[PDB]
Design a protein around this ligand. Structure first.
Ligand SMILES: O=C(O)[C@@](O)(COP(=O)(O)O)[C@H](O)[C@H](O)COP(=O)(O)O
Ligand SMILES: O=C(O)[C@@](O)(COP(=O)(O)O)[C@H](O)[C@H](O)COP(=O)(O)O
Ligand SMILES: [Mg+2]
Ligand SMILES: [Mg+2]
Ligand SMILES: [Mg+2]
Ligand SMILES: [Mg+2]
Lengths: 480, 138, 480, 120, 239, 120
């Protein structure tokens, strides 16, 4: 017996103990969504015996203000406002115990301009909750008022095309191969041959940073020599993605500043550096007139399986906000996962000023991009010029088509490989622009161009029947 | 106030039998044991005074209990603690430290504050016991 | 017809075209593992019709030097050395088409001291390959020679206990609640009450950074006042985990430097800042005598599902290398996922100087830690003092037991909640040390202590029957 | 100049530099001792006797905390100084910062205990 | 007294002097680890000093020992940190001269520090009365310790790439006279030497900055000479 | 309120930093320094835990006459946006201009989280 016992809360909601999250304010099917709210769509798979609304309310609670037992300290805050609300819970089509949960979060929950803070709430703890055996974040509605606190792309595709003086076609690129083992001088050789032969860009591989077989400075030095040789040889602006990925921010800055000092138009970074280093680089790139390419290293660890993780379209949104200028977004027909309708959703999320709901493409929220600049999608991995009609159709005009093996694997050399890709691209673009059914006629369009291009003839002969036909793991829940 | 340094200071002052069981535990792990005392209760007083050398390779708890009694004859008016040390590579540190004697009255600490830049302050923990010289504190 | 056609490679291995990865050097069942090799164990689920060795060889190739078609540029390098080798491919027990693939990588593939580079190779692209419908990284053998290029924990548990002057028991802590919405001054109130009542630490919630409802500086200022009040009240060293998580490295540094200037013993960061910011902070913490707590925000996006992603034990290895001093590692009995044998593996990975193979705990590689300091595991989320016997048994002596709801949810106030937890802990520790069967007697040990501790009596009455019994998603493939 | 190459000359089977005369005009281009024994004694307030000191032992292996313990006991017992061993820098068994922090605690404990200036 | 009662009676950690060879620093059955730093010393003991005791003294006094027993050993993992002389051999064609092989755990050393490595290996042992002479002949630096060092900034492979000079030795020359030349005369010699065919010339070791020539003019004239010689020959050159 | 108003940004920073070093809870600035110096100081004040008082020096040159200039309520909005912690906003009964209903509007503009249309 004491003053503590005497002043205990008798109110049923705020007396001590455990009560369901759906009775704590985190379930409200009548909640009126505000235009400033952050919305999230989760695919929720409850454990046996767990109610779908309760699972959804738990996700809402533990990603906003709740814990597992009632706390009086709620009453020191405007708690009715700060609690997130699951406001719609629906069955996912063609599943037994899987649900779409729409959750609203007030704009005041979040730190302005911080991907780390947004993700700390939305994905921090809720994916490990015992009560849901699986959870996937499918989409988010980032309101205009929160988007305005972010830079968006440092450069964006419009300014990128202006810097490169290249309009009305995809960009071309290539990853240098083998992935690891080349010296700085050999790296420069490959870059020179690829650019001089017709490619707009080449790139360091994601895992090429600084290593015993090649330290970073010589690579950057030889690479800019190769670039400038190729510019003088062709009269085109050219670039090589110098990879500044490193262990610490100080090392990344040292590498980015050196690349800047050499006059590169472009650098790259890997997703594995993480969100805070990426945002830091996005700001640096805006300040230093640099195209910032993001390789999505590690993304498929959480993005591959339909029942659990984070769909890549959400990552597209966060990285566009963070300030990258390119991101890898799929090929459909190459060696990596890529359902065509999912990919269409990714490319639209990166490039459009505004998205309408489009359930077949996995676009669950209307998304105003608040005039943030546009991210150039990058199609890379296991593609070849025999697919050029398919690439132009699935992926469109605003993309970098990267052919690593598809350039350097050419039997007549790296220049020949580059020339094949460049001729194939222009042949397909001109046919599309003339109104031709270039998808139906594509193989013949490529054969016709090959009649006056030995390198293309050889590339078609070598690779034309190479396909990567496998069932997709990441697929839509609705069809047109 | 009660000084809540030591592993068991939210429990009542340990009996000699409880202490002997903790000593038995230390012996069973082949930990070295020592006894230290102080009349500066500061939380960052890292070096309490040594009561002899640590006892290494101890077979018998009674040897430790003897020295506990002997230390108490000289210093039962102040703090006495028992420590156990593990010299296994990667530990090489204390692995147990508990209070076995306290003064009858511990006045505790004044929190001293000084104004610094903008809203920052500098802080100090002033022991009321240390208002008097060693030998006259408790 | 030309000099390019004339100098084409006639050699079958290096002539142009596609050949299986298992015939490119990436499968070698006779490979002799070197003590400097980085080893990885992958759980591989091939698509229908894909051979298990070929899938394994593809993972090996595309995480080292290979691409999808043959490249002559291999021959400019010591390619036999740089190619990774899948050297053992085994069926996973109790599965139909799932395999353990052991892969060896030469130490020269990697940048010294860089988690970003290690992960760029091991997890960069291989999880998105069409040909494997699922892939999980289960374990790695990080050789001593590569470990010596990393700092390891800034502080480590040994120095941490010395700074805190706390030995022979778990640390106690608590996350401040509600998660979001409290002001700086109210935050300080909670911290003061919790520390003064018996907790060693409190912490900012992972999503508490700087927001409209509370900006970071006032929180840090009130928090250090609360800490120093509690130190003067108790004579113990106390701490509050000031969260320095922010959008950019410059902002994180500003927050860390301010916390340092105030004299905090401890700060925290969120995993969502990413590997490069984490490594940067690990170095900063060593330089500035700071305990660095890592909250694992977002980890469960890739760590939850057995067939795909990354097992948490690998993350434990990378974060120990990176230099964090605490990491969240499970409770077994709380609100978040935690099989006891998996958790035992995690805790051992974080704390031991050396690990032997232990298949029931998911430890697939012998791991020498090269005298890198030890990470303090953190048990947090949905736990209460009625479980103290279970926590001491499952989790051991070297851990921070964090009770957020389990402190602040106490009906008689925050001090009472803290006191209940502290008394429960010491009562259980003393019983364990006396040789008592404290798991069998645990409920009675707690009842006995409650006879002279009102706060503990109340906490037991309120929560003693609260359990979180659900089937685990992350489980072993072998039993003892 | 004086020792760069001449000790390796084939024509001399051995060579030893025994002494040098450094002229005053060249000496004046050097600082000489930062402190010097006179100012040192003034800082320490210790005159008319040798200083005393001790190297902490074992040479290697001690923790920062245990280093501070030895320093405290030695200074408090009567030594003017103690010192890090030559090979004690920063190592897996003890990183340098904790050693310096514990050492100054030990030094200041010993100063308060004795009324003497002490150092490590 | 408590001090009397708590004196260590255990033979090894009881106070007093015992030979280094009985303190743990001599172990001919020690299993060398691949992480150990190894040293080979040529040991010339004083008359009446046994070769093993001298080698154990070197091992002890370059790792953890001093001349008398200290209880503070027992606060550390002393069995691991003690260096072990693990093999002693007579040197062929000498009297009273021995090869001593000594092993040191990797944890004894500061990562990436030559100062620290040398502070242990050569710090004090060459001055011990008990050895009349001592020479460090070789060391085994383990891969795990090597990985904490940068190694050469450039290295010969990258150097040849920078110079564009493969398949032959480089050529050079030290400018002479060693001392006394002006900056402008230095540049003259550099130009003539490079232009006539050398890849490099160099400052003499004792050419720093002096009354007869300050350093800046030397560098300024030297780079003029280098670039003159590059233009004259089409080769990369250096000074 | 230590007034850090000065001719250049460097001089203002010198004065604000000295005030910070002395431990003042509060400083002031004058509106005549202008919008960019004000925004700069607003950011500085957030970074340095300082209450920033804005004196509205010169405001009445454009705010007094009903037919021409800028009504002070607009200035309230911009200065609230800019980061000032106080602003002078009228007394009604004192020596300076202040209609009671206009003043209510000013005060509400500065203090409320949300304003509804209120024509009077
Ligand atoms: O490492 C590789 O495999 C690549 O360099 C492609 O090489 P090739 O051009 O020789 O295939 C790219 O990094 C992947 O395309 C990334 O995949 P995504 O674009 O899906 O992130
Ligand atoms: O946000 C939360 O839920 C917590 O603050 C716990 O609050 P309670 O103490 O009130 O449950 C912790 O961040 C989780 O324990 C993290 O999970 P894990 O340790 O598994 O990473
Ligand atoms: Mg790549
Ligand atoms: Mg939390
Ligand atoms: Mg010495
Ligand atoms: Mg010379």
């Amino acid at each position: 017996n004491s003053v503590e016992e005497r002043t205990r809360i008798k109110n049923e909601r705020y007396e001590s103990g455990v009560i369901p999250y759906a009775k704590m304010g985190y379930w409200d099917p009548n909640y009126a969504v505000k235009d400033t709210d952050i919305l999230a769509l989760f695919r929720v798979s409850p454990q046996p015996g767990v109610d779908p609304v309760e699972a959804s309310a738990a996700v809402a609670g533990e990603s906003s203000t709740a814990t597992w037992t009632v706390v009086w300290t709620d009453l020191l805050t405007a708690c009715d406002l700060y609690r997130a609300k699951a406001y719609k819970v629906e069955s996912v089509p063609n599943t037994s115990d899987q649900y779409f949960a729409y959750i609203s979060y007030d704009i005041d929950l979040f730190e302005e301009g911080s991907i780390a803070n947004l993700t700390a709430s939305i994905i921090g703890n809720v994916f490990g909750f015992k009560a849901v055996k699986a959870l996937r974040l499918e989409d988010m509605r980032i309101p205009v008022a929160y988007l305005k606190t972010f830079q968006g792309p440092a450069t964006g595709i419009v300014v990128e095309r202006e810097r490169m003086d290249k309009f009305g076609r995809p960009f071309l690129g290539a990853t240098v191969k083998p992935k690891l083992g080349l010296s700085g001088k050999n790296y420069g050789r490959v870059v020179y041959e690829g650019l001089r032969g017709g490619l707009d860009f080449l790139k360091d591989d994601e895992n090429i940073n600084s290593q015993p077989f090649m330290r970073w400075k010589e690579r950057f030095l030889y690479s800019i020599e190769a670039v400038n040789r190729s510019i003088a040889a062709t009269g085109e602006v050219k670039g090589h993605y110098m990879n500044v990925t490193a262990a610490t921010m100080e090392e990344m800055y040292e590498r980015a500043e050196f690349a800047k000092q050499l006059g590169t138009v472009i650098i790259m970074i890997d997703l594995v550096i993480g969100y805070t280093a990426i945002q830091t680089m996005g700001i640096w790139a805006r300040k230093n007139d640099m195209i910032l390419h993001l390789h999505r290293a590690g993304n498929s660890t959480y993005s591959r399986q339909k029942i659990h993780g984070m769909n890549f379209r959400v990552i597209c949104k966060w990285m566009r906000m963070a300030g990258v200028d390119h991101i890898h977004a799929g090929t459909v027909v190459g060696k990596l996962e890529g359902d065509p309708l999912m990919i269409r959703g990714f490319y639209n999320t990166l490039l459009l000023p505004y998205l309408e709901v489009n359930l077949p493409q996995g676009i669950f929220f209307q998304q105003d991009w608040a005039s943030l600049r546009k991210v150039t999608p990058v199609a890379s991995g296991g593609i070849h010029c025999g697919q050029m009609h398919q690439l132009l159709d699935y992926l469109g005009n605003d993309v970098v088509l990267q052919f690593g093996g598809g350039t350097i694997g050419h039997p007549d050399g790296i220049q020949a490989g580059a020339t094949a890709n460049r001729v194939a691209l222009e042949s397909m673009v001109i046919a599309r622009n003339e109104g031709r059914d270039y998808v139906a006629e594509g193989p013949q369009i490529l054969r016709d161009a090959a009649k006056t291009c030995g390198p293309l003839q050889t590339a078609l002969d070598l690779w034309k029947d190479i396909t990567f036909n496998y069932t997709s793991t990441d697929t839509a829940d609705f069809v047109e | 106030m009660r000084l809540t340094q030591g592993t068991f200071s939210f429990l009542p002052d340990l009996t000699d039998e409880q202490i002997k069981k903790q000593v038995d535990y230390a012996i069973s792990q082949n930990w070295a044991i020592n006894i230290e005392y102080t009349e500066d209760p500061h939380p960052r007083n890292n070096f309490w005074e040594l009561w002899g050398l640590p006892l290494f390779d101890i077979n018998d708890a009674a040897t430790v209990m003897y020295e506990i009694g002997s230390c108490r004859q000289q210093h039962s008016n102040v703090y006495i603690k028992v420590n156990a040390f593990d010299n296994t590579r990667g530990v090489e540190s204390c692995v147990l430290s508990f209070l076995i004697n306290r003064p009858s009255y511990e006045p505790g600490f004044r929190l001293v504050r000084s104004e610094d830049i903008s809203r920052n302050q500098k802080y100090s923990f002033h022991s009321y016991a240390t208002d008097k010289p060693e030998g006259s504190r408790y």
